Amino acid sequence: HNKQLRESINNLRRERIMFESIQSNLERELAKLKRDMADMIQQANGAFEAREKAIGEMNALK
Amino acid sequence: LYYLLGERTRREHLAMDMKVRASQQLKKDSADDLYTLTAHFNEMRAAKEQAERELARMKR
Amino acid sequence: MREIVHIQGGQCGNQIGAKFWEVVSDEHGIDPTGTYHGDSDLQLERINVYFNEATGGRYVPRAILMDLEPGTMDSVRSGPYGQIFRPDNFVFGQTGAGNNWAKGHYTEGAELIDSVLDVVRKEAESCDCLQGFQVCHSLGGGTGSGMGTLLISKIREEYPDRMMLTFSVVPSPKVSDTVVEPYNATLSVHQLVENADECMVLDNEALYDICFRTLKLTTPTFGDLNHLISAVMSGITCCLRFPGQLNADLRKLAVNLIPFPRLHFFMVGFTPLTSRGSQQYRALTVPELTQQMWDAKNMMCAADPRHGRYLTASALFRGRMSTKEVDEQMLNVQNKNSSYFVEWIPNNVKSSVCDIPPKGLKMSATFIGNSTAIQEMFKRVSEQFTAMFRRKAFLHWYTGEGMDEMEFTEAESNMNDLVSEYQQYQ
Amino acid sequence: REVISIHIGQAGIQVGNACWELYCLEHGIQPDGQMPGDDAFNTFFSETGAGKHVPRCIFLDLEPTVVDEVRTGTYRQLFHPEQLISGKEDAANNFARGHYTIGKEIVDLALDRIRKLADNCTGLQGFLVFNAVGGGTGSGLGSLLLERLSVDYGKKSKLGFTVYPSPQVSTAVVEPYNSVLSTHSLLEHTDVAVMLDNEAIYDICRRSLDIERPTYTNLNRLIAQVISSLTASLRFDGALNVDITEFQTNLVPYPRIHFMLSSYAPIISAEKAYHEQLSVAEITNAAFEPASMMVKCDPRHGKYMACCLMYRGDVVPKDVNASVATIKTKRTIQFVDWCPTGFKCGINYQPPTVVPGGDLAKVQRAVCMISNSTAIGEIFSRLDHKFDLMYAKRAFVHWYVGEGMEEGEFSEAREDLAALEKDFEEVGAE
Amino acid sequence: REVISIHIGQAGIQVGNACWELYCLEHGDAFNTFFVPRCIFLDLEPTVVDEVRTGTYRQLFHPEQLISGKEDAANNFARGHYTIGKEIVDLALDRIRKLADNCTGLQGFLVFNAVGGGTGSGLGSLLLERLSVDYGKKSKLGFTVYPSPQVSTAVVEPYNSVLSTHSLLEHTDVAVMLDNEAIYDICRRSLDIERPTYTNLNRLIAQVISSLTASLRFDGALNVDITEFQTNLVPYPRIHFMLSSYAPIISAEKAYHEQLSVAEITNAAFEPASMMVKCDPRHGKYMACCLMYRGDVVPKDVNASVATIKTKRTIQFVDWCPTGFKCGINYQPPTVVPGGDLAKVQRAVCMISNSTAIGEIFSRLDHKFDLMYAKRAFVHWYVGEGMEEGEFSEAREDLAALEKDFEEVGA
Amino acid sequence: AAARERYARKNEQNELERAFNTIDSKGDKKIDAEELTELFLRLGHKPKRGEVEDMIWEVDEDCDGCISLLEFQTLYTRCRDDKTGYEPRGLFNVVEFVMNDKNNQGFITLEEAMQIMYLRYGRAELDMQLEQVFGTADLNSGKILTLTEFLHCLHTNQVKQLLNRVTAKT
Amino acid sequence: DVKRKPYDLLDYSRNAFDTDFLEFNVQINDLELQLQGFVNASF
Ligand SMILES: Nc1nc2c(ncn2[C@@H]2O[C@H](COP(=O)(O)OP(=O)(O)OP(=O)(O)O)[C@@H](O)[C@H]2O)c(=O)[nH]1
Ligand SMILES: Nc1nc2c(ncn2[C@@H]2O[C@H](COP(=O)(O)OP(=O)(O)OP(=O)(O)O)[C@@H](O)[C@H]2O)c(=O)[nH]1
Ligand SMILES: Nc1nc2c(ncn2[C@@H]2O[C@H](COP(=O)(O)OP(=O)(O)O)[C@@H](O)[C@H]2O)c(=O)[nH]1
């Protein structure tokens, strides 16, 4: 009976390995996605900043 | 003792599973955010293509 | 499914069980040769609780006969339904105890109970999920008291998480067969308080008055008393063998009826019990069953509950009946006679219904009441024990065999604290 | 629009043997499972293979006999064998044995059967559980199963139709302990929980159904009618429909007040049916008198928070709305001040059918009322008296403590129910 | 399009007694791939072979095809490899040659053996060696029976299993593991036979074999021949040991109530409670899966089901293989055998995958083998038969290399 | 009671790091079952046939096989705050002994410092784990500490409430 | 409180002050950390 209990415990610990492994992959993927989030925000912001400049010069020239 | 070690290990494994499930929610919705936000970038991109187009018209 | 092995000790235990297996086999439709002849499927589906199919429709009872004299064992195989028991289950000494509890507990026990335990162990592992054990014995004899007592102690050490019943007749001053009855009673009960899960107190006085006034018999031989006791024992286990509207196993009754762990001695009754002159003039209703059930004279113990208060009570009903009548009858019998029931427990009566009556009757009942009046019996034997012990009469067969003086003093002390804690909880 | 129904314990699956008989008879399905559009049956039965219908239900119990009669009964074919769960030994009116000793190994199998039932469904409305809190199987693994359901789904509705132990009519002794320890989880795990006393159903069938000797069969029969009446809105189209997520919002004014008094109308016998016509006006009256309620308690001592009204049959919204107006302007019953409108009505077209051998007459139209009030607070106090009455000397606690419990949960659960008493009382106060 | 099947040992030809019963019943031009049958039973004990000769199929089998020796191998790999195999193996392969000569488009050979015995291990390995020399390029499908950890009928079966697998690496191209304890558990759990014999086991093994060769016998929406398993499931030349599973293994009572569709049976084929090998695929990481579909199945839902599997997280996949599936659809529904314990089904699925849970089995076997070998127990029997002390240790180190290979690839 | 524990951890951390390195005999970070026997020999105690395997089995719970310094702090902290956890403590004891050692034969009065840190307890409670008396000192070794701790944990674990429960009198 | 206790401090005939010293040694560090927080708290 002790041996039976031992095997059940070993199983839960082994099941933990793959879960924690896939969790590490998910953090990496979410990190890659969120870094891209910051980079794309900056690019969109640059276009907007450029836009107000172009509109101001057009109005001023007139 | 072993009958209770098993309960603590089961608790630890479930605490990881509910964590894994929550991680998938973060993965999914963040992908959705990229689609909506890149649409926003295209709209601003479209705005400036039309914008510098009419500037040159006024210059000529 | 759930299985109960049967253990019969001594002469009283052996003869009680012989009539028990006859009555049970008639309920399931097995002829004395041990073959199946029933009609309904409800009889074949629940014979694994008490029997094992051997080969070709051979159903053998799951019972163990155990004693110290050959006369009892031979008297079993002589009578009908005597050929159904497996001969290996006749664990059996030869010398005898001689109504000497020490000889049944220290001298002769040491060489038989090991053999008894082998057969009992084989019958426990022969089944899958034990519900409990069932022991029928006396408290005044030697080979029933001492032999069965040590067996009970050893069994509880082996299988502790399992139920256990002991159907025990106790001695009383008016029906006094042996002379050393108090020495046997107080020591035997001293073991039952710490070993048995729950015990059912029986005595011969009540049996004699049931056959005098209710049954109105002229020559009540021991066959009729054993016939009465068998109907009660079949009633306590009908829930395991037949489906019903409200099932109640052994564990369900014990956990519900025993409010404190040492207070597990019960008083029993049975209904209906009617004479042949009045078996035609009666009706069969739940209230008619209830009053004859709760009657003081109809208790199968000579301890009047109306001298005290009821702690808990239980009813096991058998037959096609309406559960509303069951519940409203228990409520009414508790409301009119409100003083006879304990106060700090509301609804002191648990009830259950099974849909299969005993063969030959339309509707029956079985009462199991845990009252506080039982302390009378403990005092009634305790003073007789102290009266004898304060001059050391009949002591040399006790002290010369292995008991010391402190064992009897331990017995009195445990006797006295139990009657004192009954007095507190009442 | 699929909902699965789970039955826990002896009383639980007995109620189910009435409901499923009634259900198959409504949709013309033979007891062997085959029919000799029409998707109304889908909410309870999945069409397997060709011309075969399987219910969306599991029976489970710790004792073998009560489940076994169903296996060999008339409906051997209707239910897939795996659904009918059984144990090896009973909990024996012991909450601890059902929550720590035997539940712990039966409920894992239960949930991985529940898993694929939910997976087979598509637009799962919710669950509905059937148990009596007096026993051990219904209480112990009942509360346990609810806890595990809350961590599995959480957001999905869990309709719990529970039977409380009646004050006077009772079969067990230790059922006070069972009810308190079970309620302690019935609070924060069930979304919507309906009480069903036993004395009420007994007293109804003695007066209205004029059956002087009623057994459990008739009790289970009328419970099926109530359940059928609030699922008719999923099964058949109506003039004004209400779904299972409407009780969530309209009947629970606070996250710890979900205990509803059920009542049905008209409970009328076969012969009186001829003599009295049953229009909408008189039946809307009959849905409020305490002589036709499913819990023996007096709502006159309390004030209503919100009520729901199922109507079945040929009912137009005109006269039912007029009748609801008439009820609110009367003063033999009263409403809580801050809630001006206390009702939610609903009408569905199909009339309730009759089962052969049943005692309900064939009626033009019927009403099922599900209200919420403060008379529920009287039951909890009445229960506290006789629970504490026995606990003050530690009676029967030795079984539960030996089975795995301690002194902490008696004291802490008792005081938690006491806090619940204060919650009902404070809301009542203006 | 023809494939011939050889059956070795008491276990191999009893399995064959179920396989050919199913084949002839199934075919009552499509039969050309199997039909006289294209088989050779061969064994060293004549008792089981003469059961075939006096059975009901006395006329079906050509008399010479039934090969039978004169004395047993005594459960000794050495005896069945060097002493008695040397006389029977030459007659066996001299028959396989002209059976292959009668064929024209031979896909490959498929062998049935149990590695715990003497014949199945010894001359089974010997026969595979000489076939690799003679043909080489033709596929050899090896359906072996490895010994279970806790259920065992012999004592020295660790010796035979290690000594057989050492050659099973470089001889068979496709190798399918089937334990007995796992199938016992399957027949107890799903088929609810509380008392199963070898007959029930051999019956559902034949169902698996027939399901993976049905693509040749009958045209399907997406056919998959014997060369596809060779390519799509073996990422490296030394990893070829495949878990097998089949669904639905359902009794008559349960099947009619259940609604069998592709998504749920694709799920059922991936739980460890329905595999033919007692191993925990959760303990491992999948490399590649192959899904055989028979019956009424359209390509949509098989693709939908495979998508749900890849997104679930109780089972994880290897990083070197993102597209780890090879599906196959065939029109013909699975046939039944009168007396068989399986009910008729509209559609069935046979999964043949590859993981690292098998890497756990070989370590578990190595420990038991290692314990007995150190104190030279039972070694003297094999040495007397013609072997020596060297080859036990060298076979041990070969399994050690395999353990390292699984731990490294899974990384 | 927190201050005793926090202050104790503040000082024992540096002792613990060297205790780890010293237990290792291969100059690596991994503690093999092989090393444990060598340590016991240094203490002067002998393991049983399967003791070491249990010792390695119970501690490690994030991977299988040899142990790592990360597992070792996890064990340390969990066991230290374990008190009402009914948790394993097979390899905690040997390390706590080595850290609480500075004499290289064992320690005498320092048990009390160990005891007070775990709980104020009582002089009678001290007479439970061992037989040390306030005035007298003793000689001690590895043999007499591990065995007594292990036995005490088995003694507490056994006692539970079945019919040993006691209710206030009527 | 330490210097009001019945035992003589110079005598090793009692040897029970060895629990008083390890109670003193914890509130000395408590005083240390209280003064450290006071320094950290006035800036
Ligand atoms: N309404 C109704 N209640 C029932 C029925 N059968 C039993 N009960 C109730 O069930 C309560 C006791 O619990 P049971 O269901 O009988 O048994 P249990 O809940 O399974 O607990 P165990 O006996 O340990 O298995 C009683 O108070 C009865 O009122 C029934 O058919 N209908
Ligand atoms: N599946 C299945 N396995 C079998 C059968 N018969 C034997 N086995 C397995 O075969 C192994 C034992 O080796 P055997 O096959 O009996 O040995 P053999 O092939 O007869 O070789 P020899 O006995 O030495 O002549 C064990 O794993 C048995 O479980 C069978 O009919 N079906
Ligand atoms: N009911 C019943 N009681 C009996 C019978 N025979 C003896 N007794 C009782 O047994 C007691 C004496 O016990 P005894 O038979 O000597 O027990 P044993 O020697 O241990 O088997 C007396 O008080 C009798 O009342 C019988 O046939 N039926």
Short mmCIF file of C-alpha atoms in Angstrom, two decimals, chain E residues 3-259:
data_model
loop_
_atom_site.label_atom_id
_atom_site.label_comp_id
_atom_site.label_asym_id
_atom_site.label_seq_id
_atom_site.Cartn_x
_atom_site.Cartn_y
_atom_site.Cartn_z
CA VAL E 3 1.16 -7.76 -48.26
CA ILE E 4 2.13 -11.15 -46.80
CA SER E 5 1.97 -11.93 -43.09
CA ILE E 6 4.08 -14.38 -41.10
CA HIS E 7 3.15 -15.56 -37.62
CA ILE E 8 5.78 -16.78 -35.15
CA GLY E 9 5.33 -18.74 -31.94
CA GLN E 10 2.37 -19.73 -29.82
CA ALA E 11 1.29 -16.11 -29.43
CA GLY E 12 1.86 -15.15 -33.06
CA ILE E 13 -0.21 -17.90 -34.63
CA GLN E 14 -3.01 -17.58 -32.07
CA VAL E 15 -3.19 -13.90 -33.01
CA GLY E 16 -3.22 -15.09 -36.62
CA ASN E 17 -6.11 -17.43 -35.87
CA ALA E 18 -8.08 -14.24 -35.17
CA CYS E 19 -6.60 -12.19 -38.02
CA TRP E 20 -7.46 -14.61 -40.84
CA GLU E 21 -10.90 -15.36 -39.43
CA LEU E 22 -11.58 -11.63 -39.74
CA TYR E 23 -10.06 -11.28 -43.22
CA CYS E 24 -12.01 -14.10 -44.87
CA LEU E 25 -15.19 -12.94 -43.16
CA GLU E 26 -14.58 -9.39 -44.40
CA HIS E 27 -14.07 -10.37 -48.06
CA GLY E 28 -16.86 -12.96 -47.85
CA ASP E 29 -10.17 -7.69 -56.77
CA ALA E 30 -10.04 -6.06 -53.34
CA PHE E 31 -9.26 -9.48 -51.83
CA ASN E 32 -6.16 -9.81 -54.03
CA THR E 33 -3.95 -8.16 -51.40
CA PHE E 34 -4.53 -11.12 -49.03
CA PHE E 35 -5.88 -13.99 -51.14
CA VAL E 36 -5.16 -19.56 -50.36
CA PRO E 37 -3.93 -17.01 -47.84
CA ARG E 38 -0.55 -15.30 -48.05
CA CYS E 39 0.62 -16.56 -44.67
CA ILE E 40 3.03 -18.98 -43.02
CA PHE E 41 2.38 -20.14 -39.49
CA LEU E 42 5.65 -21.36 -38.00
CA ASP E 43 6.42 -22.74 -34.55
CA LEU E 44 8.76 -25.18 -32.86
CA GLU E 45 6.04 -27.06 -30.93
CA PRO E 46 3.50 -28.97 -33.07
CA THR E 47 0.56 -28.77 -30.66
CA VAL E 48 -0.76 -25.33 -31.63
CA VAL E 49 -0.07 -25.81 -35.37
CA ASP E 50 -2.04 -29.07 -35.49
CA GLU E 51 -4.89 -27.19 -33.84
CA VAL E 52 -5.01 -25.26 -37.12
CA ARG E 53 -4.65 -28.47 -39.15
CA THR E 54 -7.63 -30.13 -37.45
CA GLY E 55 -9.70 -26.96 -37.03
CA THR E 56 -12.42 -25.51 -39.22
CA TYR E 57 -9.94 -23.86 -41.60
CA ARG E 58 -8.42 -27.17 -42.67
CA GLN E 59 -9.04 -26.48 -46.36
CA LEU E 60 -8.27 -22.74 -46.42
CA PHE E 61 -4.55 -22.99 -45.68
CA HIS E 62 -2.25 -24.78 -48.08
CA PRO E 63 -0.70 -27.72 -46.20
CA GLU E 64 2.95 -26.70 -46.60
CA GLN E 65 2.38 -23.13 -45.34
CA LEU E 66 1.75 -24.49 -41.84
CA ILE E 67 5.32 -24.94 -40.58
CA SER E 68 5.84 -26.92 -37.37
CA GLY E 69 9.04 -28.02 -35.66
CA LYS E 70 9.76 -31.13 -33.64
CA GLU E 71 10.67 -29.80 -30.18
CA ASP E 72 10.10 -26.64 -28.17
CA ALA E 73 12.49 -23.75 -27.55
CA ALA E 74 12.09 -24.15 -23.75
CA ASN E 75 11.53 -20.40 -23.25
CA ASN E 76 15.20 -19.82 -24.05
CA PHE E 77 16.24 -17.14 -26.52
CA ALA E 78 19.49 -19.04 -26.98
CA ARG E 79 17.77 -22.34 -27.72
CA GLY E 80 15.34 -20.69 -30.13
CA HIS E 81 18.10 -18.72 -31.86
CA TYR E 82 21.10 -21.06 -32.16
CA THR E 83 20.04 -24.67 -31.48
CA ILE E 84 16.56 -25.31 -32.89
CA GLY E 85 16.01 -22.18 -34.99
CA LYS E 86 18.85 -23.20 -37.30
CA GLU E 87 16.78 -26.12 -38.62
CA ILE E 88 13.38 -24.47 -39.11
CA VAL E 89 14.37 -20.97 -40.25
CA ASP E 90 15.79 -22.12 -43.59
CA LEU E 91 12.58 -23.93 -44.51
CA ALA E 92 10.54 -20.89 -43.46
CA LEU E 93 12.36 -18.37 -45.67
CA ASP E 94 12.51 -20.80 -48.60
CA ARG E 95 8.69 -20.55 -48.56
CA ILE E 96 8.48 -16.78 -48.08
CA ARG E 97 10.60 -16.40 -51.22
CA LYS E 98 8.22 -18.09 -53.62
CA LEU E 99 5.18 -16.53 -51.94
CA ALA E 100 6.78 -13.16 -52.66
CA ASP E 101 7.61 -14.51 -56.12
CA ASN E 102 3.91 -15.11 -56.79
CA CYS E 103 3.27 -11.50 -55.76
CA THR E 104 4.04 -8.57 -58.06
CA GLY E 105 3.54 -5.31 -56.15
CA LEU E 106 4.58 -6.43 -52.68
CA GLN E 107 4.27 -3.59 -50.19
CA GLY E 108 6.03 -5.38 -47.36
CA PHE E 109 6.03 -8.13 -44.78
CA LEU E 110 4.30 -7.90 -41.42
CA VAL E 111 5.38 -10.08 -38.50
CA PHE E 112 3.59 -11.10 -35.30
CA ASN E 113 5.60 -12.20 -32.28
CA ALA E 114 5.88 -12.06 -28.50
CA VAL E 115 9.33 -11.22 -27.13
CA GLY E 116 8.91 -13.03 -23.81
CA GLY E 117 9.05 -16.54 -25.26
CA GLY E 118 11.78 -18.55 -26.90
CA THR E 119 10.51 -18.94 -30.45
CA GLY E 120 8.99 -15.48 -30.77
CA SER E 121 12.19 -13.90 -29.49
CA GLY E 122 14.86 -16.24 -30.81
CA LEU E 123 13.91 -17.39 -34.30
CA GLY E 124 11.73 -14.31 -34.68
CA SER E 125 14.86 -12.18 -34.52
CA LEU E 126 16.74 -14.71 -36.66
CA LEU E 127 14.05 -14.65 -39.35
CA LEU E 128 14.02 -10.84 -39.42
CA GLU E 129 17.81 -10.79 -39.85
CA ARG E 130 17.82 -12.97 -42.97
CA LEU E 131 14.84 -11.12 -44.45
CA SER E 132 16.71 -7.82 -44.09
CA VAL E 133 19.59 -9.37 -46.04
CA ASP E 134 17.37 -10.80 -48.78
CA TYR E 135 15.07 -7.80 -49.37
CA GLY E 136 16.18 -4.87 -47.22
CA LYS E 137 14.18 -2.16 -48.97
CA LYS E 138 10.77 -3.74 -48.26
CA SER E 139 8.94 -2.63 -45.14
CA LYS E 140 8.66 -5.06 -42.22
CA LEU E 141 5.83 -4.29 -39.78
CA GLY E 142 6.68 -5.69 -36.36
CA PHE E 143 3.79 -6.06 -33.90
CA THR E 144 5.51 -7.25 -30.73
CA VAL E 145 4.21 -8.12 -27.27
CA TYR E 146 6.53 -6.80 -24.60
CA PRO E 147 6.21 -8.18 -21.06
CA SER E 148 4.22 -6.09 -18.62
CA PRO E 149 5.74 -4.76 -15.37
CA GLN E 150 3.40 -6.39 -12.83
CA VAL E 151 1.54 -9.06 -14.84
CA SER E 152 3.88 -11.86 -15.85
CA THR E 153 3.65 -15.53 -16.75
CA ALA E 154 7.38 -16.32 -16.98
CA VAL E 155 10.46 -15.57 -14.87
CA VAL E 156 13.35 -15.08 -17.31
CA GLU E 157 11.33 -12.93 -19.70
CA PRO E 158 13.54 -9.87 -18.94
CA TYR E 159 16.47 -11.76 -20.47
CA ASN E 160 14.51 -12.53 -23.62
CA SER E 161 13.00 -9.05 -23.96
CA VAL E 162 16.35 -7.25 -23.77
CA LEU E 163 18.05 -9.84 -25.99
CA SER E 164 15.24 -9.56 -28.55
CA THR E 165 14.97 -5.77 -28.64
CA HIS E 166 18.71 -5.47 -29.33
CA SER E 167 18.10 -6.92 -32.78
CA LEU E 168 14.62 -5.40 -33.09
CA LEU E 169 16.24 -1.94 -33.38
CA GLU E 170 18.07 -2.41 -36.67
CA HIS E 171 15.86 -5.04 -38.34
CA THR E 172 12.21 -3.99 -38.23
CA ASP E 173 11.32 -0.63 -39.74
CA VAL E 174 8.00 -0.14 -37.93
CA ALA E 175 7.51 -1.59 -34.45
CA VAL E 176 4.26 -1.47 -32.48
CA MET E 177 4.25 -2.22 -28.75
CA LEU E 178 1.39 -4.21 -27.22
CA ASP E 179 1.45 -5.32 -23.61
CA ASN E 180 -0.98 -7.82 -22.11
CA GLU E 181 -1.70 -6.12 -18.80
CA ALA E 182 -2.83 -2.94 -20.58
CA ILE E 183 -5.25 -4.85 -22.82
CA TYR E 184 -6.55 -6.75 -19.81
CA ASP E 185 -7.34 -3.37 -18.25
CA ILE E 186 -8.99 -2.22 -21.49
CA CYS E 187 -11.28 -5.25 -21.71
CA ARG E 188 -12.18 -4.80 -18.04
CA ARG E 189 -12.88 -1.06 -18.21
CA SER E 190 -14.53 -0.41 -21.58
CA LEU E 191 -15.67 -3.85 -22.79
CA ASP E 192 -16.70 -4.89 -19.23
CA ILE E 193 -15.50 -8.47 -19.54
CA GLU E 194 -14.47 -9.27 -15.97
CA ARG E 195 -12.92 -12.63 -16.98
CA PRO E 196 -11.02 -12.25 -20.27
CA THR E 197 -8.90 -14.88 -21.99
CA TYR E 198 -6.35 -14.69 -24.80
CA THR E 199 -9.13 -15.04 -27.38
CA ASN E 200 -10.64 -11.62 -26.64
CA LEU E 201 -7.20 -9.99 -26.72
CA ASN E 202 -6.32 -11.54 -30.08
CA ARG E 203 -9.70 -10.50 -31.49
CA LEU E 204 -9.21 -6.76 -30.91
CA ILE E 205 -5.58 -6.94 -32.02
CA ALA E 206 -6.87 -8.17 -35.38
CA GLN E 207 -9.25 -5.20 -35.45
CA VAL E 208 -6.28 -2.84 -35.15
CA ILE E 209 -4.29 -4.60 -37.89
CA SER E 210 -7.25 -4.62 -40.27
CA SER E 211 -7.85 -0.90 -39.69
CA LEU E 212 -4.35 0.13 -40.79
CA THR E 213 -4.36 -2.09 -43.90
CA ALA E 214 -7.91 -1.16 -45.00
CA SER E 215 -6.44 1.74 -47.00
CA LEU E 216 -4.97 -0.83 -49.40
CA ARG E 217 -8.00 -3.13 -49.60
CA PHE E 218 -10.60 -0.40 -50.18
CA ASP E 219 -10.60 3.06 -51.71
CA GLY E 220 -10.98 6.00 -49.33
CA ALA E 221 -11.34 9.76 -49.48
CA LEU E 222 -7.69 10.07 -48.37
CA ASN E 223 -5.71 6.86 -48.74
CA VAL E 224 -2.53 6.12 -46.81
CA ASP E 225 -0.36 3.16 -47.77
CA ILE E 226 2.28 1.20 -45.86
CA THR E 227 5.13 3.52 -46.89
CA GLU E 228 3.48 6.52 -45.20
CA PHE E 229 3.94 5.24 -41.65
CA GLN E 230 7.57 4.65 -42.64
CA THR E 231 8.00 8.36 -43.38
CA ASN E 232 5.52 10.41 -41.35
CA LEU E 233 6.05 8.73 -37.96
CA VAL E 234 9.76 7.91 -37.70
CA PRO E 235 11.75 11.13 -37.18
CA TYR E 236 15.04 9.31 -36.56
CA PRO E 237 16.38 5.89 -37.61
CA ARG E 238 16.58 4.55 -34.03
CA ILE E 239 13.23 5.78 -32.72
CA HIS E 240 10.58 3.39 -34.04
CA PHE E 241 8.33 2.11 -31.26
CA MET E 242 4.73 3.24 -31.48
CA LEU E 243 1.88 3.39 -29.02
CA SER E 244 -1.36 2.02 -30.42
CA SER E 245 -4.97 2.71 -29.54
CA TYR E 246 -8.37 2.09 -31.06
CA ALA E 247 -11.79 3.59 -30.60
CA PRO E 248 -14.50 2.93 -29.91
CA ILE E 249 -13.81 -0.27 -27.97
CA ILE E 250 -17.39 -0.34 -26.75
CA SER E 251 -19.77 -3.10 -25.69
CA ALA E 252 -23.12 -3.56 -27.41
CA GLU E 253 -25.14 -2.08 -24.54
CA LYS E 254 -23.15 1.16 -24.24
CA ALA E 255 -22.52 1.80 -27.94
CA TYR E 256 -26.13 2.30 -29.00
CA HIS E 257 -26.74 4.82 -26.21
CA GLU E 258 -23.56 6.74 -27.02
CA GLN E 259 -23.46 9.17 -29.92
#
